[PDB]
Amino acid sequence: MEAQPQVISATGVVKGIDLESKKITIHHDPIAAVNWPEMTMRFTITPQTKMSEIKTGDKVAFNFVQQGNLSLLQDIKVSQ
Numbered sequence: 001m002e003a004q005p006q007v008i009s010a011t012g013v014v015k016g017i018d019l020e021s022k023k024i025t026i027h028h029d030p031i032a033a034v035n036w037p038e039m040t041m042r043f044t045i046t047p048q049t050k051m052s053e054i055k056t057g058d059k060v061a062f063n064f065v066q067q068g069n070l071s072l073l074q075d076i077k078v079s080q
């Protein structure tokens with residue numbers, strides 16, 4: 001609804017992943033929607049994040065929302 005954050009799409013390379021602590025670090029390409037340059041950033045897996053098999057070193061396509069100080073993944077998959 002109205003106050004909820006918008007869904008941001010991006011692409012990048014997985015630098016590391018820890019399913020136990022719900023952490024994925026992604027070196028992503030620029031994101032115009034939030035005025036971010038190419039960056040490495042901490043993303044957060046939630047129980048709702050729609051995942052496929054992801055491993056360190058994979059190129060990925062993903063969507064997230066910014067909710068306070070966390071970047072919450074909505075979905076992630078390997079990409080070309």
Ligand SMILES: [Ag+]
Pocket residue numbers: 028036039040041
């Ligand atoms: Ag970022």
